[PDB]
Structures are given as C-alpha cells and as structure tokens.
Amino acid sequence: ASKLRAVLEKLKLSRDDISTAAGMVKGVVDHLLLRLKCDSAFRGVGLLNTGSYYEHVKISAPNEFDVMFKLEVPRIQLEEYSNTRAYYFVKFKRNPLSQFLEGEILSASKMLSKFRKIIKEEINDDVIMKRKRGGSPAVTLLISEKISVDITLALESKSSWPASTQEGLRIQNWLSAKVRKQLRLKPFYLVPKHAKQEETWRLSFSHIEKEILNNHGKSKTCCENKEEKCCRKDCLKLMKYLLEQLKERFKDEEHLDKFSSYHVKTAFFHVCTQNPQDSQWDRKDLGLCFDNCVTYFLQCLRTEKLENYFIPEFNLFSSNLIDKRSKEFLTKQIEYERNNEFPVFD
Ligand SMILES: Cc1nn(-c2nc3c(Cl)c(Cl)ccc3[nH]2)c(O)c1[C@H]1OC(=O)c2ccccc21
Numbered sequence: 001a002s003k004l005r006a007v008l009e010k011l012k013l014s015r016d017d018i019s020t021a022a023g024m025v026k027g028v029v030d031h032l033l034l035r036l037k038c039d040s041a042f043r044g045v046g047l048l049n050t051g052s053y054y055e056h057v058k059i060s061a062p063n064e065f066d067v068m069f070k071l072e073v074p075r076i077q078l079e080e081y082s083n084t085r086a087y088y089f090v091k092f093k094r095n096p097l098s099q100f101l102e103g104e105i106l107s108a109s110k111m112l113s114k115f116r117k118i119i120k121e122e123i124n125d126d127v128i129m130k131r132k133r134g135g136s137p138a139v140t141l142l143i144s145e146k147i148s149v150d151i152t153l154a155l156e157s158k159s160s161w162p163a164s165t166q167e168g169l170r171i172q173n174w175l176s177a178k179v180r181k182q183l184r185l186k187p188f189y190l191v192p193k194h195a196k197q198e199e200t201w202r203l204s205f206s207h208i209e210k211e212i213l214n215n216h217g218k219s220k221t222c223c224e225n226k227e228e229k230c231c232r233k234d235c236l237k238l239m240k241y242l243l244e245q246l247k248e249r250f251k252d253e254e255h256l257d258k259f260s261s262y263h264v265k266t267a268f269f270h271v272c273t274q275n276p277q278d279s280q281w282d283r284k285d286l287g288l289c290f291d292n293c294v295t296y297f298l299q300c301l302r303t304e305k306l307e308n309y310f311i312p313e314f315n316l317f318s319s320n321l322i323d324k325r326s327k328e329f330l331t332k333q334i335e336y337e338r339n340n341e342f343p344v345f346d
C-alpha cells in the first residue's frame with residue numbers, strides 16, 4: 001500500500017537527522033568506557049563487535065539510544081535456574097571479579113551496584129543519570145533533556161551455546177546450515193535480569209539478530225543491487241511501529257505492558273523461516289508481506305504460542321508471563337487495525 005511506504009519514508013526521515021546526536025552519544029560512551037576501565041573490576045569492558053555503538057529499540061523514537069557494555073570474563077560455568085531455559089546462575093570454572101562473589105555464585109546485584117555507582121559519579125563531569133527496573137538496562141543517561149541512552153551490562157562467554165539453544169536458530173533452509181554453524185561459533189552474552197530471584201543472568205543473542213537482519217537473504221547479494229531488493233527489513237520496521245503505536249495509544253491501560261519489540265522481532269524471524277525464499281519478499285509485495293507478518297503474529301496470540309527464536313522451549317506468550325486477557329486484548333486491537341487498513345499509521 002501507499003500508506004505503508006508513506007510510513008516508512010517518515011520513519012526514514014526521522015532517522016536521518018541523527019548523525020549529530022550519534023556523535024554526542026559516541027563521545028559519552030567512549031568516556032564512560034575509559035572511566036570504567038580504570039576500575040579493577042571492569043578492566044575488560046567494551047562494546048559488542050556489532051559495527052555500531054548503539055541500537056534503537058523503538059523505531060519511532062530516534063532520541064532513545066540503547067547501548068550494551070560487554071565484559072570479557074574468565075571461563076564461565078552456568079547453572080540453569082528452575083527450568084526457565086534462559087536464566088542462569090553464573091560461576092567461575094577455577095578460583096578479578098572475586099569481589100562480586102556471593103559464595104560460588106557471581107552476584108548480579110553487587111555488580112550492578114558498582115556499575116551504577118561508577119557511572120553516577122562520572123556524569124558529574126549537561127548529562128543527568130537515571131536508573132530503571134529489571135537489572136537491564138542498568139542505567140539511563142539523559143543528555144540535554146532531549147537524548148536518552150540506556151546502558152546494559154553483559155557478560156561475554158566464548159563457551160558453546162547453552163543446551164536450550166540446541167533446536168533454535170532454525171535458519172538452515174533460509175540462510176543455510178553453513179551459516180548456522182558459523183553463527184553458533186560466536187560468543188553469547190548474559191545480562192543481569194531478575195527471574196519472577198535477584199542474582200540470575202539472562203541469555204542475550206541481540207548480536208546474532210543484528211547479523212541476520214543485515215545479511216538476511218537466501219542470496220548473498222540480497223539488497224546489494226537493484227535486481228535484488230527485498231522488503232524484509234521494511235516489514236520488521238512496520239511491525240515494530242505497529243506495536244509502538246498501540247503501546248502508546250493504550251499506555252494508560254494495562255493490557256500492553258508485557259509486550260515489547262522483542263515479541264514482534266521474534267515473530268518476524270519465524271516468518272522468515274516459514275518464507276525462506278527472496279522471491280517471497282519482493283519489494284513490490286510489501287503489502288502482502290506485511291500482512292503475512294501481521295497474521296502470523298495473530299496466530300501466535302490466539303494459540304498463545306510464541307517460541308523464542310534461539311530457545312524454542314521458552315514460550316514468550318506463556319500464561320506464566322502474559323495473561324490470556326492481555327493477548328486477547330492485543331489480538332482484538334490488531335484485528336481492528338488490519339480490518340480498517342491501520343488507522344495507527346495515519
Ligand atoms: C535487548 C533485549 N533483549 N531481550 C531478550 N529477551 C529475551 C528472552 Cl525473554 C529470552 Cl527467553 C532469551 C533472550 C532474550 N533477549 C529483551 O527482553 C530486550 C529488551 O528487554 C531488555 O532486557 C532490554 C534492555 C535494553 C533495551 C532493550 C531490552
């Protein structure tokens with residue numbers, strides 16, 4: 001539709017005026033990184049080798065930056081927490097981070113305390129500091145009351161991926177078995193995150209998601225020339241913007257608080273697996289391809305089944321995580337939008 005392309009254009013224009021905001025953020029990040037390196041506990045801190053200082057959780061909020069600080073640590077040993085499949089206690093194989101030990105277990109709260117305290121005393125050099133909920137992001141910088149920067153601490157592990165990822169990343173018929181093998185040789189990450197326990201760490205594969213999104217076709221030259229333009233990334237942007245607009249419209253009702261961009265990005269990767277050919281994503285079929293993403297997301301809400309793309313036993317739409325009414329709420333809203341050609345995009 002012409003409205004979908006209209007939305008994408010405006011999302012693109014609001015993105016283009018950011019190279020000045022990025023430079024600022026990059027300056028604050030390089031400063032905090034040098035400061036964190038001074039402390040003996042965070043000597044191995046750095047950025048994920050993803051090719052960017054930052055990401056944007058919300059495509060409609062170019063002023064809200066998101067940054068991850070990775071921590072190179074000695075070989076980590078992982079104890080699953082309570083069959084949650086994605087949350088773990090962190091331990092050291094053999095006897096620098098010893099100050100954060102609560103016995104044999106690496107303490108997230110003790111490491112969060114020092115991380116936050118160090119960044120608190122460093123923003124005193126037009127930047128205030130704020131802290132939020134969960135454990136991740138750990139802190140939130142506020143630059144000139146116009147730009148926010150969420151910062152997440154992440155432990156880096158070069159061990160093999162956890163057992164719960166064994167049947168995930170089902171890209172073999174899309175991106176190939178060779179690629180899946182290469183990707184699973186890369187490190188994984190753990191972010192401090194409470195489990196509904198205060199000292200757990202949650203797996204993070206955001207760096208793998210980025211690699212897939214930026215190298216997304218069956219053809220190695222997908223989107224590198226005019227003959228091979230697909231609408232995969234445009235469809236993901238529209239799904240993100242859809243959810244972002246619904247959460248903004250219903251922010252003062254409760255039923256959408258448990259949904260996030262992680263849910264639409266997960267459902268999108270499943271649709272890429274279901275439609276592995278570049279010819280199922282021709283730029284001229286944007287409206288049909290976007291509709292395919294909407295209706296797959298609805299099927300997930302109705303059946304209350306949204307498997308984590310990396311950890312297939314973790315059901316993101318589990319009753320234990322999101323109440324059946326909330327999913328019925330969102331199913332209704334999306335059906336309404338679909339049936340009325342998406343007023344939220346007007
Ligand atoms: C970036 C991100 N990744 N991510 C995620 N959720 C996962 C689940 Cl549920 C399983 Cl089972 C396995 C792996 C998961 N990765 C997730 O929720 C988020 C958002 O929330 C955060 O932590 C956060 C912090 C800063 C910005 C954005 C977010």
Ligand SMILES: [Zn+2]
Nearest residue numbers: 217222223230
């Ligand atoms: Zn492409």
